[PDB]
mmCIF file of all heavy atoms in Angstrom:
data_model
loop_
_atom_site.group_PDB
_atom_site.id
_atom_site.type_symbol
_atom_site.label_atom_id
_atom_site.label_comp_id
_atom_site.label_asym_id
_atom_site.label_seq_id
_atom_site.Cartn_x
_atom_site.Cartn_y
_atom_site.Cartn_z
ATOM 1 N N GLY A 4 147.534 36.130 -57.274
ATOM 2 C CA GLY A 4 146.388 37.139 -57.193
ATOM 3 C C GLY A 4 146.764 38.145 -56.060
ATOM 4 O O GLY A 4 147.785 38.033 -55.116
ATOM 5 N N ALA A 10 148.735 38.260 -48.592
ATOM 6 C CA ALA A 10 148.820 37.162 -47.526
ATOM 7 C C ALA A 10 150.215 36.580 -47.378
ATOM 8 O O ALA A 10 150.629 36.410 -46.314
ATOM 9 C CB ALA A 10 147.833 35.993 -47.821
ATOM 10 N N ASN A 19 154.221 46.311 -42.383
ATOM 11 C CA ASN A 19 154.808 47.431 -41.564
ATOM 12 C C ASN A 19 156.512 47.238 -41.248
ATOM 13 O O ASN A 19 156.958 47.910 -40.352
ATOM 14 C CB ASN A 19 154.127 47.734 -40.307
ATOM 15 C CG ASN A 19 153.127 48.652 -40.451
ATOM 16 O OD1 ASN A 19 152.079 48.529 -40.607
ATOM 17 N ND2 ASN A 19 153.621 50.044 -40.649
ATOM 18 N N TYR A 20 156.991 46.425 -42.213
ATOM 19 C CA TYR A 20 158.530 46.263 -42.103
ATOM 20 C C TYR A 20 159.126 47.687 -42.521
ATOM 21 O O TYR A 20 158.809 48.183 -43.532
ATOM 22 C CB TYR A 20 159.000 45.275 -42.976
ATOM 23 C CG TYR A 20 160.406 44.809 -42.895
ATOM 24 C CD1 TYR A 20 160.815 43.877 -41.811
ATOM 25 C CD2 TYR A 20 161.410 45.472 -43.469
ATOM 26 C CE1 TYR A 20 162.200 43.626 -41.622
ATOM 27 C CE2 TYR A 20 162.730 45.190 -43.167
ATOM 28 C CZ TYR A 20 163.169 44.375 -42.234
ATOM 29 O OH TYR A 20 164.460 44.072 -41.998
ATOM 30 N N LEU A 25 151.488 46.992 -45.336
ATOM 31 C CA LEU A 25 151.346 45.930 -46.459
ATOM 32 C C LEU A 25 150.903 46.511 -47.898
ATOM 33 O O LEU A 25 151.493 46.083 -48.870
ATOM 34 C CB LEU A 25 150.344 44.937 -46.053
ATOM 35 C CG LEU A 25 150.259 43.537 -46.737
ATOM 36 C CD1 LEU A 25 151.751 42.969 -46.737
ATOM 37 C CD2 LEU A 25 149.290 42.581 -45.991
ATOM 38 N N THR A 47 169.208 49.652 -68.532
ATOM 39 C CA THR A 47 170.141 50.330 -69.578
ATOM 40 C C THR A 47 171.688 49.987 -69.367
ATOM 41 O O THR A 47 172.411 49.788 -70.355
ATOM 42 C CB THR A 47 169.898 51.874 -69.630
ATOM 43 O OG1 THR A 47 170.327 52.479 -68.439
ATOM 44 C CG2 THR A 47 168.491 52.187 -69.830
ATOM 45 N N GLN A 57 161.297 43.024 -58.490
ATOM 46 C CA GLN A 57 162.455 43.533 -59.498
ATOM 47 C C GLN A 57 163.691 43.957 -59.037
ATOM 48 O O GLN A 57 164.074 45.108 -59.071
ATOM 49 C CB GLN A 57 161.690 44.628 -60.422
ATOM 50 C CG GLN A 57 160.597 44.167 -61.329
ATOM 51 C CD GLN A 57 161.268 43.318 -62.393
ATOM 52 O OE1 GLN A 57 161.812 43.838 -63.563
ATOM 53 N NE2 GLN A 57 161.219 41.893 -62.344
ATOM 54 N N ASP A 101 168.330 49.946 -46.315
ATOM 55 C CA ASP A 101 169.574 50.536 -46.975
ATOM 56 C C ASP A 101 169.775 52.018 -46.576
ATOM 57 O O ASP A 101 170.958 52.510 -46.889
ATOM 58 C CB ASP A 101 169.331 50.641 -48.604
ATOM 59 C CG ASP A 101 170.427 50.040 -49.352
ATOM 60 O OD1 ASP A 101 171.616 50.159 -48.836
ATOM 61 O OD2 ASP A 101 170.087 49.568 -50.418
ATOM 62 N N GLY A 102 168.797 52.762 -46.122
ATOM 63 C CA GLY A 102 168.768 54.150 -45.951
ATOM 64 C C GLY A 102 167.724 54.938 -46.655
ATOM 65 O O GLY A 102 167.292 56.013 -46.160
ATOM 66 N N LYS A 116 153.837 55.820 -53.662
ATOM 67 C CA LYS A 116 154.210 56.759 -52.652
ATOM 68 C C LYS A 116 153.151 57.826 -52.559
ATOM 69 O O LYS A 116 152.746 58.563 -53.546
ATOM 70 C CB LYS A 116 155.638 57.427 -52.863
ATOM 71 C CG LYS A 116 156.103 58.313 -51.731
ATOM 72 C CD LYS A 116 157.440 58.870 -52.178
ATOM 73 C CE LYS A 116 158.063 59.577 -50.995
ATOM 74 N NZ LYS A 116 159.443 60.126 -51.401
ATOM 75 N N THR A 118 149.996 57.714 -52.220
ATOM 76 C CA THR A 118 148.642 57.322 -52.784
ATOM 77 C C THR A 118 147.992 56.483 -51.518
ATOM 78 O O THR A 118 148.493 56.132 -50.619
ATOM 79 C CB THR A 118 148.741 56.530 -54.012
ATOM 80 O OG1 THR A 118 149.283 55.084 -53.728
ATOM 81 C CG2 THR A 118 149.553 57.206 -55.133
ATOM 82 N N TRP A 123 145.045 48.579 -51.980
ATOM 83 C CA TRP A 123 145.768 47.366 -52.443
ATOM 84 C C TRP A 123 145.419 45.981 -51.606
ATOM 85 O O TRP A 123 145.712 44.960 -52.062
ATOM 86 C CB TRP A 123 147.199 47.617 -52.847
ATOM 87 C CG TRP A 123 147.426 48.290 -53.901
ATOM 88 C CD1 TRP A 123 147.724 49.736 -53.854
ATOM 89 C CD2 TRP A 123 147.230 48.071 -55.229
ATOM 90 N NE1 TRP A 123 147.714 50.265 -55.116
ATOM 91 C CE2 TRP A 123 147.538 49.183 -56.013
ATOM 92 C CE3 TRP A 123 146.977 46.955 -55.922
ATOM 93 C CZ2 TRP A 123 147.499 49.286 -57.363
ATOM 94 C CZ3 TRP A 123 146.886 46.837 -57.308
ATOM 95 C CH2 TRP A 123 147.205 48.038 -58.051
#
Side-chain angles (χ1 to χ4, degrees):
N19 270 103
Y20 188 90
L25 196 55
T47 67
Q57 290 291 281
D101 229 330
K116 183 182 191 177
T118 71
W123 289 102

